[PDB]
A and B are shown apart, each in its own frame.
With several copies, the nearest count.
Chain A
Amino acid sequence: SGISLDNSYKMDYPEMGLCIIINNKNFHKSTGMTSRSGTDVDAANLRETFRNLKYEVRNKNDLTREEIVELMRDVSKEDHSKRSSFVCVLLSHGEEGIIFGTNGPVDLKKITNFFRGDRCRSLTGKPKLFIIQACRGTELDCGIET
């Protein structure tokens, strides 16, 4: 055939892929973390937005640190051969490099490692997108007038 460049990911597989949305609104009292009001608005907006992009959306609510890890592990073990990509959205409290389950923290690295090129072969060479709505610290941007 003609010149082939391969500058963009192949996104015409039978399926666009999964869009896992983890929406944590209510946290265990012992954690002392406040409920994240308005997060359901985000969860619904995302479900609809990615639905229109043809992603197989799966919404999960108020997951403990254990359930988050179990979910990601199970999802990474699925056969993504016929899927073009993978998307995971995390909505929760957090700190730098951390996302909070309802009962404690989860290192983001632990979550993403399940999808490493050598650990999830059916996603090797395919885009793995992690969208993170959570604090990365306590600094505040005072901004500057334009």
Chain B
Amino acid sequence: HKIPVEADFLYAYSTAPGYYSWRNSKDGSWFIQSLCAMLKQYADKLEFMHILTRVNRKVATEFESFSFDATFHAKKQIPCIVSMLTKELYFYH
């Protein structure tokens, strides 16, 4: 029996392929703020993929850029969950 050498990897990207990733100079990056908040609130209750899904919704709905530069003003962001995991992951047991 063998398993792929690329199996059991999970990449939690802050943004979709090809996109900028936003950061607030005072509150931190949108993604990390949201990730920590969701882990603090759901790590002892939800499976990791479901936690990350809440992170996606939080980032997608609660954040929007503000800039004097029209090019970077009113932009949005959606994180990107990339899973090669082979089992469900709970931080508790």
Contact = CB atoms under 8 A, between A and B. Distances in A.
Interface of A: 6-9, 11-12, 16, 36-39, 41-42, 45-46, 48-50, 52-53, 85, 91, 94, 96, 109, 112, 115-119, 124-146
Given A37-B25, A124-B3, A132-B12, A139 B20 contact: yes
Contacts of B80: 136
A127 B29 contact: no
Interface string B71-93: 11011111010000101111111
A117 B88 contact: no
B78 A127 contact: no
Contact of A135 (B20, B24, B74, B78): B20
Contacts of B36: 45-46, 48-49
18 contacts: A7-B54, A12-B93, A42-B33, A45-B33, A49-B40, A50-B39, A52-B43, A91-B29, A96-B17, A124-B8, A131-B12, A133-B29, A135-B15, A135-B21, A140-B75, A142-B75, A143-B2, A146-B3
B76 to A, nearest CB: 4
A52 B23 CA distance: 24
Nearest to A52: B40
A137 B18 contact: yes
Contact of B5 (A16, A96, A136, A143): A143
Interface residues of B, number: 55
Interface of B: 1-21, 23-29, 31-33, 35-36, 39-40, 43, 47, 54, 64, 71-72, 74-78, 80, 85, 87-93
Given A45-B36, A49-B36, A125-B3, A139 B23 contact: no
A144 B33 CA distance: 23
Contacts of A129: 9-10, 12
Nearest to B1: A146
Given A125-B3, A132-B12, A133-B29, A11 B23 contact: no
A47 to B, nearest CB: 10
A137 B93 contact: no
Contacts of B10: 127-130
